[PDB]
């Protein structure tokens with residue numbers, strides 16, 4: 001009621017006169033922005049429930065131990081230490097963006113790290129909600145896996161999005177292999193347990209299926225060859241082709257290689273419902289006929305793209321110019337959230353027609369941090385900010401599509417490297433796989449992680465993958 | 472009815488190994504699989520290089536670096552090896568059978584598959600011509616209340632994970648608390664119970680993490696942590712020369728570890744424990760020590776499957792700490808069952824060093840029984856003139872934190888090296904690297920140490 005004692009702790013740092021920049025998230029957008037932001041001019045704070053950066057492109061190779069989970073992650077604090085200014089990291093979850101009081105509500109607070117010598121005691125307690133005040137908000141919370149309303153995918157499948165997904169996939173499949181080996185050959189249960197279904201025909205599903213097939217063919221086969229021969233990996237894609245962002249002939253090369261490695265590819269197929277031990281697939285053939293197949297499965301990996309998070313969809317309702325948003329926050333040429341003077345959005349929580357990739361998020365981040373370099377030289381910056389951008393002739397953000405890669409298992413990849421209308425590489429094969437490796441190694445954001453991936457690959461040359469069920 | 476597994480395909484005798492640790496694996500490496508059919512029962516699918524375990528909680532090495540799947544040892548074997556991921560619950564010497572429960576998997580590493588018809592979580596009995604018992608010993612709380620519920624043992628991979636999880640959770644809460652808060656000092660307190668090399672290295676590793684890595688980004692937090700080493704004896708590291716013990720304790724205290732000698736834990740509660748000191752004069756003082764993390768790095772005791780076995784063999788009722796065995800590591804009262812490592816008593820210390828020399832010796836004895844047609848058919852070792860097992864102590868090593876170690880290297884009566892220092896620490900690393908049982912594990916440890924020279928240890932709460 002009106003007599004409520006409601007009191008939310010509000011953190012509002014006003015020692016210095018540097019503007020307070022608040023970043024939400026710890027992934028491609030947030031970390032890249034962090035790497036470039038000038039902490040000599042701004043006070044930076046980061047809210048994220050994940051204390052590390054995740055190098056996503058190598059995640060599909062983590063479940064089978066091609067790389068280790070720890071090798072592809074890097075603690076926020078390690079990026080923060082390399083900054084000259086003051087950085088604070090709230091290990092917490094942003095639950096509400098409050099644009100009219102310039103505040104972000106946080107919950108599930110585990111920790112706060114102030115990487116500066118005269119720490120001020122904030123008076124926060126774990127699992128007590130709070131609000132962090134901001135002069136500028138940079139929203140990069142990303143997006144979450146989409147089930148498209150299909151029943152059972154959450155309960156019975158595994159997403160391929162975060163590190164614990166990698167661990168669950170390994171655990172489920174390892175357990176399945178153990179039960180299966182106890183069953184006699186020809187048992188359909190054994191066949192089911194050794195059966196893997198990967199939904200999603202983009203590079204993530206494809207690499208996931210390729211890495212799994214690699215594990216089975218190169219490592220499992222060495223000690224349980226009979227069991228290795230019976231595993232069946234399915235790749236299920238709703239479109240007529242896989243890897244539809246590549247040249248159609250590279251897609252065809254890819255499907256053939258996949259099929260040659262023994263992966264069964266179902267095109268024009270969508271999953272209608274998922275039950276504990278089987279799922280229902282429907283194929284929409286080119287003529288127009290529709291068939292149904294019931295597919296027994298031991299392990300289901302759901303790799304089919306994302307949707308806006310609740311904190312973002314709630315924000316849609318609170319900003320008039322944003323009510324009609326569906327896939328992400330609508331931003332202007334300068335990456336300002338529309339209907340806001342104060343809030344910027346980069347990465348997959350923003351939608352501007354570009355593809356939802358790290359490549360985009362990383363360029364957005366670099367561009368935005370550079371704009372913060374310029375705003376810091378123009379005293380009028382600290383609701384006229386959209387006009388200030390044009391008045392000072394800031395350039396709109398301009399995405400340079402640099403291409404795409406996909407590893408296919410058994411040491412084959414496809415790749416198209418470009419810039420502008422200039423194509424520098426486009427093909428597939430053995431040497432494209434070496435390129436896949438060198439390039440991905442190059443794109444890792446931290447020396448440490450880069451060393452670890454390198455060491456993992458070296459160990460892969462001499463020894464089998466580590467595939468521990470509980471470690 | 473009860474399933475019984477008796478592989479009489481071959482006339483090769485069935486050697487059944489229990490365990491997958493220092494005894495069982497060292498034996499597996501030396502046994503001739505062209506003369507024997509080998510099976511292995513163990514709830515743990517991997518060998519654990521125990522001496523690097525204290526260095527795993529803070530990520531000086533990774534957990535995966537110091538372990539090695541049994542299967543990898545078994546693929547190097549020329550013959551047929553079978554591994555049952557299950558727990559031996561009952562040795563049945565009269566019928567030559569081992570009962571197994573909690574079965575997870577069975578891996579026949581041989582070309583002609585036999586469907587054994589086993590189901591998970593379903594009791595079975597494995598039959599043997601020769602049994603090799605090596606289930607080791609389990610942690611001993613010495614009847615002290617609270618240690619099981621409130622502390623962590625330091626014996627197995629899961630223990631390393633638990634310690635890291637407990638301590639990382641503590642640093643997080645503590646840092647949210649205001650400086651001066653006693654709950655903050657409690658959360659930043661670690662008590663390690665055990666003054667042997669294990670407890671010491673555990674403490675030095677935690678201290679290393681605190682001073683080298685945690686201090687880099689939360690220096691005030693790192694100053695406030697207090698690590699406590701509690702030891703019942705009047706010196707730490709009592710198997711060494713007393714001068715090295717003095718060097719050690721003095722170093723440990725110099726790194727800010729508080730060392731409590733002549734002190735025993737009387738009882739443990741959730742947030743605090745009772746330590747009693749018996750002074751040389753004979754008086755007893757007592758201290759309630761608040762703690763955030765308790766690591767219990769002391770004590771062995773025999774496992775129940777070995778305890779039950781006592782009351783089944785005549786010459787073994789009088790056994791308390793292990794299986795009494797003769798000069799040939801044969802369990803007294805059997806011609807069937809041998810025992811090595813911590814589950815066997817023979818006057819020797821319970822160490823990996825002893826376990827590994829026993830195993831190598833025993834497998835060399837099996838090289839001979841396969842040359843004497845009597846053992847195949849037919850107190851037989853005497854008449855055939857098998858030399859008894861002779862233990863050669865090669866020395867001892869202890870890392871002390873902050874790049875210092877102590878070491879004594881010996882063979883027979885001669886001592887080749889005995890000291891402590893900077894170089895001793897480098898020696899520590901080389902020796903331990905040379906004692907790892909597999910190329911893979913050795914490589915992973917080596918990379919971990921290289922990585923350490925350039926970067927802070929990985930200390931993830933949930934990985």
Ligand SMILES: Cc1cc2nc3c(=O)[nH]c(=O)nc-3n(C[C@H](O)[C@H](O)[C@H](O)COP(=O)(O)OP(=O)(O)OC[C@H]3O[C@@H](n4cnc5c(N)ncnc54)[C@H](O)[C@@H]3O)c2cc1C
Pocket residue numbers: 024025026027028029030047048049050056057058059060092093094095140141142143160161203204309311346347348349356357358359360361
């Ligand atoms: C398995 C996989 C492989 C991929 N491979 C490629 C590839 O090869 N090439 C490519 O271009 N793209 C690839 N992508 C896509 C790329 O990773 C994403 O487009 C990119 O992550 C977008 O960056 P982001 O910062 O918007 O989201 P993310 O990098 O996912 O970061 C979101 C961050 O916000 C945090 N967060 C979540 N909720 C909250 C909240 N409530 N409050 C505060 N923080 C929150 C998350 O923990 C995370 O730290 C891959 C994606 C996946 C899943």
Ligand SMILES: Cc1cc2nc3c(=O)[nH]c(=O)nc-3n(C[C@H](O)[C@H](O)[C@H](O)COP(=O)(O)OP(=O)(O)OC[C@H]3O[C@@H](n4cnc5c(N)ncnc54)[C@H](O)[C@@H]3O)c2cc1C
Pocket residue numbers: 489490491492493494495512513514515517521522523524525557558559560605606607608625626668669774776811812813814821822823824825826
């Ligand atoms: C942290 C630590 C550090 C150590 N450092 C050293 C050192 O530096 N130098 C040294 O000489 N000694 C050291 N030791 C002692 C050494 O580890 C033991 O003496 C050694 O384990 C003895 O070998 P073992 O084969 O008898 O037992 P273990 O190596 O413990 O092997 C026991 C095996 O049996 C399995 N098992 C358990 N129960 C059953 C069951 N019911 N059925 C079948 N299998 C079962 C276990 O999973 C394990 O695989 C250390 C010990 C610890 C805990």
Ligand SMILES: [Mg+2]
Pocket residue numbers: 024025026027028029030031140141142347
């Ligand atoms: Mg982000």
Ligand SMILES: [Mg+2]
Pocket residue numbers: 027028054056142161
């Ligand atoms: Mg991510």
Ligand SMILES: [Mg+2]
Pocket residue numbers: 029139140141142143346347348349350
């Ligand atoms: Mg985003």
Ligand SMILES: [Mg+2]
Pocket residue numbers: 141142143144348
């Ligand atoms: Mg995302």
Ligand SMILES: [Mg+2]
Pocket residue numbers: 218460461462463464
């Ligand atoms: Mg290999």
Ligand SMILES: [Mg+2]
Pocket residue numbers: 489490491492493494495496605606607812
């Ligand atoms: Mg053993």
Ligand SMILES: [Mg+2]
Pocket residue numbers: 491492493518519520521
């Ligand atoms: Mg062991």
Ligand SMILES: [Mg+2]
Pocket residue numbers: 494604605606607608811812813814815
């Ligand atoms: Mg034993």
Ligand SMILES: [Mg+2]
Pocket residue numbers: 606607608609813
């Ligand atoms: Mg033991």
Ligand SMILES: [Mg+2]
Pocket residue numbers: 621637741762763764765
């Ligand atoms: Mg506790």
Ligand SMILES: [Mg+2]
Pocket residue numbers: 683684923924926927928
């Ligand atoms: Mg370090």
